[PDB]
Design an enzyme around this catalytic site. Structure first.
Site, short mmCIF file in Angstrom:
data_model
loop_
_atom_site.label_atom_id
_atom_site.label_comp_id
_atom_site.label_asym_id
_atom_site.label_seq_id
_atom_site.Cartn_x
_atom_site.Cartn_y
_atom_site.Cartn_z
N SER A 102 0.41 -1.04 0.22
CA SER A 102 0.24 0.21 -0.02
C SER A 102 1.00 1.43 0.02
O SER A 102 0.58 2.06 -1.03
CB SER A 102 -0.77 0.24 1.71
OG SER A 102 -1.54 -1.60 1.60
N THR A 155 -2.18 4.69 2.85
CA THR A 155 -2.77 5.87 1.85
C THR A 155 -2.95 7.17 2.43
O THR A 155 -2.62 7.73 1.74
CB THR A 155 -4.01 5.14 1.98
OG1 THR A 155 -3.83 4.12 0.87
CG2 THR A 155 -5.11 5.83 1.37
N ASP A 362 -6.24 0.67 -4.13
CA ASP A 362 -4.53 1.19 -3.92
C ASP A 362 -3.70 -0.76 -4.96
O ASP A 362 -2.87 -0.43 -4.98
CB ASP A 362 -4.14 1.36 -2.80
CG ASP A 362 -4.54 0.27 -1.96
OD1 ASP A 362 -5.60 -0.67 -1.99
OD2 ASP A 362 -3.64 -0.94 -0.98
N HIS A 363 -4.39 -1.56 -4.48
CA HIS A 363 -3.85 -2.74 -5.03
C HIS A 363 -4.96 -3.72 -5.25
O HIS A 363 -5.74 -3.30 -3.72
CB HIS A 363 -2.41 -2.76 -5.00
CG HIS A 363 -2.36 -3.47 -3.75
ND1 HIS A 363 -1.47 -4.24 -2.84
CD2 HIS A 363 -3.07 -2.52 -2.61
CE1 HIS A 363 -1.19 -4.31 -0.99
NE2 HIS A 363 -2.27 -3.31 -0.93
N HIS A 397 -1.72 -9.27 -0.88
CA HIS A 397 -1.75 -8.05 -1.75
C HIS A 397 -1.44 -9.41 -3.65
O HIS A 397 -1.29 -10.21 -3.83
CB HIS A 397 -0.70 -7.59 -1.96
#
EC number: 3.1.3.1
Lengths: 434, 435
Positions: A102, A155, A362-363, A397
């Site tokens: 992130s 973030t 973000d992903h 992720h």
């Protein structure tokens, strides 16, 4: 002058079992889309980020909460859509690192430069790059940063801090983990100390725990970071009542709302996914969390308040809103939460007519919607959706490109394949930041 | 002088370690996008389907073959993009079944009606519905059906067959599994038999093995479906040389190319992913398949021959192209690279012609995920050396996620945003002015 429609209704139009029944379109989009296109200057930008909210996570939340032929009045109502890349760089080689974390992704869209997994506000040579909030602020624009997670989280942090590691939360962890940034070593300070220096007009979220930490140098040494905030003129707020009484928030009175020691509370609770939990356990219905409270504002509420305060600035504003907190119900409930924030953002944006609203992640994370009879190597959970049918999810992720969606001026720049760093240059050019 | 643009280059424009170096955009997109909007009628449509190619598979193949800052010149070049849903329905209840199979997803975009998993061209009451190929043909258009998989596979078959089970390949299988469609029972026949009846102007793919079966009833009883196709006026080609000899294909002389008994040969060879394969084994580099051939027409060659033969029709054409041919990262990426060559061909044509709608999408998303190099996952993983000289690890079914749909041409605006797989049928109908 044809000022920009939002996608009205994209729900299945009729009886899903019948010809034409599951259609989401009632016609041809060509002229709706033509009127969606404006290149004129965006007076404000609202950027909503779902932690880990790729396409798979939007689909599972729609299936659960709206039913498969349903439609999120916020997330799915943005007319311009594309996909973007978010690979990171390996620090020693500068070669691509296919699965970002992130921090590097948050850095890529706030500064427009790729970096390594773990960095905030620094490139692979540990040099700092200016963020979109630092730049908006330098231009006289009001700025706000909102999260449901710790404000020190990657973030929100990436807009205000420049440290070589996302772990350098506060003084303790910075002296030890980011020596070059440690205030005692001439560095710029921890994520929380850089937050305070950065003075965003509206900052709201969780993470009050590290504000209890005490400075090790600087004119506020020995004082805790909460005491420094108040000492510097921040108006602190710690519940929904106090946030609602706030009439103005600006460079002379920065609002800082700390509503949770760690993360703010999760909207829905459910059992953890288990090995073969779809075969061996009942389909789950998610329970609203009793302990979410009429004292704790919601993401939609924080968003609306932030928009209310920030819009008094006659030059425009930038606002980032992050929706963050194998627990499928908590996962799905946070996408519902965010949808309500996007809705509010769109409500304002349509009325104002000069706001770019951008919704993306973000992903990607690792849950997949899978066939109810599956023998997965993993953790699964069968769920009872709006449709009265069960959905099984399976469980980190991942590297997949994902959806980015926009509405308002300059939104055409998100259609097609872009890269997460292009988002910085799109926002910067939209806002006329020189 | 108006021309609608394709995205000529959205690779990282510079040094990906520097400020602005990883940007894929070099300026403002608005004007290019409005120049991409046209509601005028589409004379032709080319629909390319990537077998299982959702956003993870596109990213994984780009990273490997083009590098992370790379650009697929076919697949990523389409300027209007959206996300579409593709859930099937439970046959008994009519309630959504969140994870479709290929057959039910193929029925949805060709017929416009949702159905149950395993169904081809029939709804949940087993009622037949005209496919977009039948209606284009009914309207005087030229039609084509190209695949690298068996022609009896779900995606090519949904265009020409209506059966209650995808497994009903030929006589044998239809009798036992689809007895209500068995030709010796008053039904319409197997997939192969209905394919032969549908008489599309060009059908090119694999699956020759079932054409060796003999029909149980009707006019061609006792002849094999291959003898039947010949008797019914079909030109059969079975390798690249004879395919390139064909001068025309139409209803009097229809083309049928059967290039492999089962699926056509895979582009790249590589090992199968393995449990703890990313730690227990070295990284793989995919190698050209020795058997891919000089003699075997590639998917961009078949797409190119189909467009040549089909554009002889004054009235237009419909062409669907399928890229398909076991937890093997290299076969998987090889086939996306394949399909991208096919998309560039369709796109050179469309960009030149000015009235072609090119849509590239997938039937449904599969389950491979791009994970971190040091992952200890419970499935099958493999590490791969990519174009960047970095390692990408891949982890291993169908999944229910919405996925990318992209388009170029008149009516391409109707793929932007969230649509449903069945909306694709209607966008094709309306573009082509059918009904």
């Amino acid at each position: 002058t044809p000022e920009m429609p939002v996608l009205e209704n994209r729900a299945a139009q009729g009886d899903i079992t019948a010809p034409g029944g599951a259609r989401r379109l009632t016609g041809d989009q060509t002229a709706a889309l033509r009127d969606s296109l404006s290149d004129k200057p965006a007076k404000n930008i609202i950027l909503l980020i779902g932690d880990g909210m790729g396409d798979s996570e939007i689909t599972a939340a729609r299936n659960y909460a709206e039913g498969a032929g349903g439609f999120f009045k916020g997330i799915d109502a943005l007319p311009l859509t594309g996909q973007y890349t978010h690979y990171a760089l390996n620090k020693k080689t500068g070669k691509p690192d296919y699965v970002t974390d992130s921090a590097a992704s948050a850095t890529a869209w706030s500064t427009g430069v790729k970096t390594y997994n773990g960095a905030l506000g620094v490139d692979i040579h540990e040099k700092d790059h200016p963020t979109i909030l630092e730049m908006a602020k330098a231009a006289g624009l009001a700025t706000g940063n909102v999260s449901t997670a710790e404000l020190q989280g990657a973030t929100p942090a990436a807009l205000v801090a420049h440290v070589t590691s996302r772990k350098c939360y506060g003084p303790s962890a910075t002296s030890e983990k980011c020596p070059g940034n440690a205030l005692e070593k001439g560095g710029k300070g921890s994520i929380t100390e850089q937050l305070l220096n950065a003075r965003a007009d509206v900052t709201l979220g969780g993470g009050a725990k590290t504000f209890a930490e005490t400075a090790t140098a600087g004119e506020w040494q020995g004082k805790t970071l909460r005491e420094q905030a108040e000492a510097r003129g921040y108006q602190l707020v710690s519940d929904a009542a106090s946030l609602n009484s706030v009439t103005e928030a600006n460079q002379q009175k920065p609002l800082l709302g700390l509503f949770a020691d760690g993360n703010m509370p999760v909207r829905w609770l459910g059992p953890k996914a288990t090995y073969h939990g779809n075969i061996d356990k009942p389909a789950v219905t998610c329970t609203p969390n009793p302990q979410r409270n009429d004292s704790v504002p919601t993401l939609a509420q924080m968003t609306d308040k932030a928009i209310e305060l920030l819009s008094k600035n006659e030059k425009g504003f930038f606002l980032q809103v992050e929706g963050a907190s194998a627990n499928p119900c908590g996962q799905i409930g946070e996408t519902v939460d965010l949808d309500e924030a996007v809705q509010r953002a769109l409500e304002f944006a349509k009325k104002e007519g000069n706001t770019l609203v951008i919704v993306t992640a973000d992903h990607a994370h690792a849950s997949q919607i899978v066939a109810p009879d599956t023998k997965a190597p993993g953790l699964t959970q069968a769920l009872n959706t709006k449709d009265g049918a069960v959905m099984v999810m399976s469980y980190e992720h991942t590297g997949s490109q994902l959806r980015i969606a926009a509405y308002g001026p300059h939104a055409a720049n998100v259609v097609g394949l872009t890269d997460q760093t292009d988002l910085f240059y799109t926002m910067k050019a939209a806002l006329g930041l020189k």
